[model samples]
Every structure is written in C-alpha cells, then in structure tokens.
Target: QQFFFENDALGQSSTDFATNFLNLWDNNREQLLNLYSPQSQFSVSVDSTSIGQESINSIFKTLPKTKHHLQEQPNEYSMETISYPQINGFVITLHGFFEETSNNKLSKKSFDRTWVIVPMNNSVIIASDLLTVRAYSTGAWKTASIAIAQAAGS
Candidate 1:
C-alpha cells in the first residue's frame, strides 16, 4: 500500500511517535539512514541495565542487506515520522524488538526482548528488545535516534 509521512498539522504525540516508528521503515535504506541522528545509538536490551548499541549493530550487520525489509516491499508505504510530548520539544524514539511475521511465519526462541526508548543528552536513544535464540522475527529490528530540538526528532 502507499504510505507517506502525513506530517500531521496536529503536531506530535506519543501515539504519533509509536505509529511513526513503524512508518520510518517504509522508506529505502539510504533515506532511512539519512533520517537518523548522527550520533544515534540503537541497542538490544535484556535486563535494561546492560545494553549496548554497538552490539546491536553488529548483530544486524550479520543479517545481510537483503534481510532489510526496505529492499523487499516493492509497493511499500513511504516513511513517516511521529512526534511526542507535543511540539514543546521532547525526544521520542521508535523501538521494535518484538516479533511479528508477515508473509512467512518464524520459529520460537528462548529469550524474548522488551523494547525501550529514552531521552538524554538532548538526543533520543533506541534500545530494542533482546532475543536469546535465533528464529524470533523482529523485522526492522533496527532503531533510530533523533534530535527533537532541531526539528530532527521526526
């Protein structure tokens, strides 16, 4: 289906942010990266205390570029952005560590992940849910960090 950022005149909201996180992936790979904050951090967390972004990227890197849904959805929707805490200025991060399979079903895993988002250092940070075993399908398991101050939080 056709999907493009609505850029709601209503501005930003937590509900908007949640939907925007899913919409972000609607774009191509290059477009997706360009939308992220330069110093963004994406991680997979198990207990929340010991989480790291570098490790998350490493895991994603192994998935192969073809695994990226951006390359797969030909009729995919355009990437969209969501805002939270109103237009007053608050950082919002899109997190997808849960498993959801479309077109094809996946096997089960031992460790399921719990997604998280936080604002600190005037920037947004994305922490995905952790998966202990393989076969858990968390498509677009990737995360993005954005700055809400410079109209960059979208």
Candidate 2:
C-alpha cells in the first residue's frame, strides 16, 4: 500500500505535470523541453501535428481542459485483469465513461484504454500507450486494435 501511494503520487504528479504543460504551451514553445522525460519517445497516430514529442507538447499545451474532467466529474472507470501474470506483467483494461450536461444539450462518450504498468521509481508508470477510443453516440464500440498497432516494441 505504501508503494501504491508513493507511485500513485508520482502518477498524479504526472497528470498535474501534463496539465501544467498544456497551460504553459499557451505562451511558450521552448517550455516543451522541460515537460518531456529525458528518455521519452513518442509514437502517436492521432494526427500529423501530434506525431512527435513537439507535437505532443503542442497538443497537450493547448488541450481543452474539459475533456480531462474525468479526473473530477462523476466519471466511471474500472480496472480488470485480462491476462494472467505473464512475464512479470499483466494486461489490464481501464474503461472510462462520462456525460456532459450544458443548457439542454447532452454529450456522452466512453473510452477504454489498456495500460501496462511496470515498476519504476518504486512506483508504476505507463509502460504502454492508449489502446482504443469509443464514443457512446456510435451505439457501439469503435473497436480499435491500437494495442496491436502500437505493440511493436518489447
């Protein structure tokens, strides 16, 4: 439990760091140099503008804070094991969903991200990237094999 809190603190700090990163990008681009892990490597396929660390920094820098309210609002998320402990790591899926209410319009979305956590700094850090995205409006899951897509490196 102690390790969980310590690493969770770092994980929370990472999220705060990302939020600060977005807020800072509004005025400075050079600041991105400080936001990334010195050993960071990126492989995003969302947009050409977000292909590298610079692009990631830019996207995060100007990201609308609304989307991340999952950290605050009555968001629903769950973690479950999808595989046995194979190779000192386990495959777990974190599914999240939430709704937005404004005036009379309503928008809702659901997302599931498969993450791999490995011990780092006596805590845990994301050892993998986002695995998929699904919007509730579609009335079905937009199955994305992002796991397979980004599962090249071991």
Q: What's each prediction's clash count?
A: 4, 1
Per-residue accuracy of model 1 over 17-80 as CA lDDT, tens digit each: 4444434432333333333343444444344222344444445444322222222331221222
| Worst 10-residue lDDT window, candidate 2 | 145-154
lDDT of 1 at 117: 38
- Please report how far candidate 1 places residue 114 from its true position, in Å: 10
Residue 48 of candidate 1: its Cα lDDT?
28
Clashing pairs in 2: 22-61
lDDT (C-alpha) at residue 1 in model 1: 10
Query: Local distance difference test, per candidate?
Result: 0.34, 0.39
Summarize candidate 2's per-residue lDDT along 81-148 as a digit string, tens digits. Answer: 43224535434454555343335565665555554544446444334434344554332322342211
Which pairs of residues collide in candidate 1?
3-77, 3-78, 13-83, 113-130
lDDT value for model 1: 0.34
- Badly placed stretches (over 4 Å) of model 2 are 1-56, 67-76, 82-87, 99-106, 137-154
